[PDB]
Design a protein around this motif. Structure first.
Motif, mmCIF file in Angstrom:
data_model
loop_
_atom_site.group_PDB
_atom_site.id
_atom_site.type_symbol
_atom_site.label_atom_id
_atom_site.label_comp_id
_atom_site.label_asym_id
_atom_site.label_seq_id
_atom_site.Cartn_x
_atom_site.Cartn_y
_atom_site.Cartn_z
ATOM 1 N N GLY A 214 54.425 48.359 72.116
ATOM 2 C CA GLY A 214 55.103 48.461 70.814
ATOM 3 C C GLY A 214 55.678 47.133 70.372
ATOM 4 N N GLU A 215 55.943 46.234 71.317
ATOM 5 C CA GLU A 215 56.413 44.872 70.965
ATOM 6 C C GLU A 215 55.306 44.175 70.166
ATOM 7 O OE1 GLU A 215 58.031 41.821 73.956
ATOM 8 O OE2 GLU A 215 58.406 41.100 71.909
ATOM 9 N N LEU A 216 54.044 44.470 70.474
ATOM 10 C CA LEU A 216 52.990 43.848 69.676
ATOM 11 C C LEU A 216 52.911 44.470 68.289
ATOM 12 C CD1 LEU A 216 50.883 41.664 69.858
ATOM 13 C CD2 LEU A 216 49.158 43.448 70.511
ATOM 14 N N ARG A 217 53.020 45.802 68.201
ATOM 15 C CA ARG A 217 53.117 46.430 66.893
ATOM 16 C C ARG A 217 54.346 45.918 66.147
ATOM 17 N NH1 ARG A 217 52.502 50.864 70.218
ATOM 18 N NH2 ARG A 217 54.395 51.883 69.423
ATOM 19 N N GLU A 218 55.453 45.698 66.846
ATOM 20 C CA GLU A 218 56.691 45.263 66.149
ATOM 21 C C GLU A 218 56.500 43.880 65.505
ATOM 22 O OE1 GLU A 218 59.232 46.966 65.124
ATOM 23 O OE2 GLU A 218 59.991 45.128 64.207
ATOM 24 N N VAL A 220 53.802 42.454 64.413
ATOM 25 C CA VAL A 220 53.013 42.643 63.190
ATOM 26 C C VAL A 220 53.897 43.143 62.057
ATOM 27 C CG1 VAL A 220 51.097 43.952 62.144
ATOM 28 C CG2 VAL A 220 50.871 43.025 64.460
ATOM 29 N N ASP A 221 54.750 44.117 62.359
ATOM 30 C CA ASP A 221 55.647 44.667 61.348
ATOM 31 C C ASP A 221 56.633 43.629 60.804
ATOM 32 O OD1 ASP A 221 55.937 47.374 60.283
ATOM 33 O OD2 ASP A 221 58.092 46.948 60.734
ATOM 34 N N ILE A 222 57.070 42.692 61.644
ATOM 35 C CA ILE A 222 57.973 41.643 61.173
ATOM 36 C C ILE A 222 57.240 40.738 60.192
ATOM 37 C CG2 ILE A 222 59.263 39.544 61.889
ATOM 38 C CD1 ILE A 222 59.591 41.154 64.650
ATOM 39 N N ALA A 223 56.019 40.351 60.549
ATOM 40 C CA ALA A 223 55.208 39.532 59.652
ATOM 41 C C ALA A 223 54.914 40.262 58.347
ATOM 42 C CB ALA A 223 53.917 39.139 60.360
ATOM 43 N N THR A 276 62.973 34.215 61.945
ATOM 44 C CA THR A 276 63.557 33.980 63.267
ATOM 45 C C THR A 276 63.270 35.158 64.202
ATOM 46 O OG1 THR A 276 65.676 34.679 62.343
ATOM 47 C CG2 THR A 276 65.315 32.383 62.519
ATOM 48 N N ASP A 277 63.290 36.395 63.675
ATOM 49 C CA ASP A 277 62.918 37.547 64.507
ATOM 50 C C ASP A 277 61.494 37.406 65.024
ATOM 51 O OD1 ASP A 277 65.369 38.669 64.135
ATOM 52 O OD2 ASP A 277 64.694 40.112 62.619
ATOM 53 N N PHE A 278 60.585 36.947 64.160
ATOM 54 C CA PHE A 278 59.196 36.726 64.579
ATOM 55 C C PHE A 278 59.110 35.707 65.710
ATOM 56 C CE2 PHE A 278 54.588 36.437 64.113
ATOM 57 C CZ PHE A 278 54.318 35.159 64.547
ATOM 58 N N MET A 279 59.783 34.557 65.574
ATOM 59 C CA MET A 279 59.657 33.557 66.636
ATOM 60 C C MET A 279 60.231 34.089 67.946
ATOM 61 S SD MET A 279 60.583 30.171 64.321
ATOM 62 C CE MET A 279 60.598 29.102 65.707
ATOM 63 N N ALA A 280 61.336 34.818 67.874
ATOM 64 C CA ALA A 280 61.902 35.386 69.101
ATOM 65 C C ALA A 280 60.950 36.400 69.731
ATOM 66 C CB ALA A 280 63.255 36.034 68.805
ATOM 67 N N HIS A 305 50.193 31.932 60.758
ATOM 68 C CA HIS A 305 49.457 31.364 59.628
ATOM 69 C C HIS A 305 49.417 32.303 58.435
ATOM 70 C CE1 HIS A 305 48.640 28.299 62.376
ATOM 71 N NE2 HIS A 305 47.611 28.864 62.992
ATOM 72 N N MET A 306 49.445 33.619 58.672
ATOM 73 C CA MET A 306 49.479 34.562 57.564
ATOM 74 C C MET A 306 50.805 34.442 56.804
ATOM 75 S SD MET A 306 47.873 37.883 59.447
ATOM 76 C CE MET A 306 46.512 37.672 60.613
ATOM 77 N N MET A 307 51.914 34.312 57.531
ATOM 78 C CA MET A 307 53.214 34.125 56.880
ATOM 79 C C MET A 307 53.246 32.795 56.136
ATOM 80 S SD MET A 307 55.979 35.528 59.617
ATOM 81 C CE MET A 307 55.118 34.976 61.017
#
Length: 354
Positions: A214-218, A220-223, A276-280, A305-307
């Motif tokens: 779910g961390e991987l799904r999360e 994606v959701d942040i992006a 910042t949530d994404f980088m963390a 790169h998408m962001m």
């Protein structure tokens, strides 16, 4: 709906750190030339006249795709550019947000026609929409693993649902509150489709990893939220000059009562929080069980790169900044919101004089 802004309003636009200059596909120029040729050959049926076709190509939808998926395989990326242009041509020719917010019969007729085309049942006047989409998805499906293709199809249908739910509550009258805007816009933005197309672009398949972690799904959701909110910041002028207010900045103005600069500051802070949530999240993922996986590392890089590419393109496109817009490379300073265009000046924040 009291106005979200008045022509000639100004505010200081800050430059988001880290993201720019965004990485672009090395073969962008070559890809965009083939894409344009394809668009003028296959989408002509959908455009009134030559001038409208040129104006639409000038917005650079294919350039968005080259900025958002800059590590994709070039031949695959050409397919995705043509898909991106197809969706923009469809929006321009088939979707009258004004007519279908005020007229439920016109909304219903559009929805029926989209069902026919999506399900590859298009006949009569709509035959070409379904023929072109069919050949395009035929090309795209080569080298597109079935577990990834099924997730992409689910994302297309989710995009339809989001677009419907946004019209549902735009003909309901209310300008959203933030929380409700979030639930609608997360689906209507359509970026969900490109997270999956990005796996195709890279030649990878993260189906099992997305199921397991779910961390991987999360991440994606942040992006997703980063991109949809960034998009709203730069599409605000054009979209709120058409009276479409499913827009985060409009929501912060009209529903939370912020002055324009304070609403921009607040939306800037929220988007920075997603960065910042994404980088963390990325640091945790690159140090955990999946950190030895080159395909996962490549995908986390691609999410960045998408962001970044989405922000970069928002400065470039006439779709948001006005007919004939050519970006002067100014990333921050006082912006003037005219009725027909966005003006980027480099005048500094200290000079706002308010």
């Amino acid at each position: 709906i009291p106005a979200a802004y008045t022509p000639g309003s100004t505010f200081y636009l800050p430059e988001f750190p880290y993201l720019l200059p965004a990485r672009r596909h090395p073969a962008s120029d070559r890809i965009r030339r083939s894409c344009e040729t394809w668009v003028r050959a296959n989408m002509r049926f959908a455009m009134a006249d030559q001038a409208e076709m040129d104006a639409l190509i000038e917005e650079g939808a294919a350039l968005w795709t080259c900025y958002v998926l800059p590590t994709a395989d070039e031949d695959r990326l050409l397919n995705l550019c043509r898909y991106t242009e197809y969706l923009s041509v469809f929006d321009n020719a088939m979707v009258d947000r004004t007519k279908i917010g005020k007229d439920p019969d016109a909304a219903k007729e559009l929805f029926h026609r989209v069902v026919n085309i999506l399900a590859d049942r298009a006949v009569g006047p709509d035959f070409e929409w379904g023929r072109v989409l069919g050949e395009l998805w035929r090309d795209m499906r080569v080298g597109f693993p079935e577990p990834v293709w099924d997730r992409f199809m689910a994302e297309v249908r989710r995009f339809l649902s989001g677009c419907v739910a946004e019209i549902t509550s735009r003909s309901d009258g209310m300008v959203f509150d933030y929380d409700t805007y979030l639930k609608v816009r997360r689906d209507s933005v359509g970026m969900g489709m490109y997270f999956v197309l990005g796996e195709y672009g890279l030649g990878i398949d993260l189906t099992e990893d997305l199921t397991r972690h779910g961390e991987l799904r999360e991440i994606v959701d942040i992006a997703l939220e980063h991109i949809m909110l960034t998009n709203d910041l730069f599409s605000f002028r054009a979209e709120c000059a058409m009276d479409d207010y499913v827009n985060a900045l409009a929501v912060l103005r009209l529903s939370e009562g912020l002055e324009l600069q304070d609403a921009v500051d607040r939306l800037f802070t929220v988007i920075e929080g997603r960065r910042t949530d994404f980088m963390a999240a990325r640091r945790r993922l690159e140090s955990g069980e999946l950190g030895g996986r080159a395909d996962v590392r490549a995908y986390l890089d691609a999410l960045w790169h998408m962001m970044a590419g989405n922000l970069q393109w928002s400065y470039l496109t006439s779709r948001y900044n006005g007919i004939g817009h050519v970006w002067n490379n100014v990333r921050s300073g006082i912006v003037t919101l005219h009725a027909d265009r966005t003006e980027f000046s480099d005048r500094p924040y200290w000079s706002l004089a308010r």
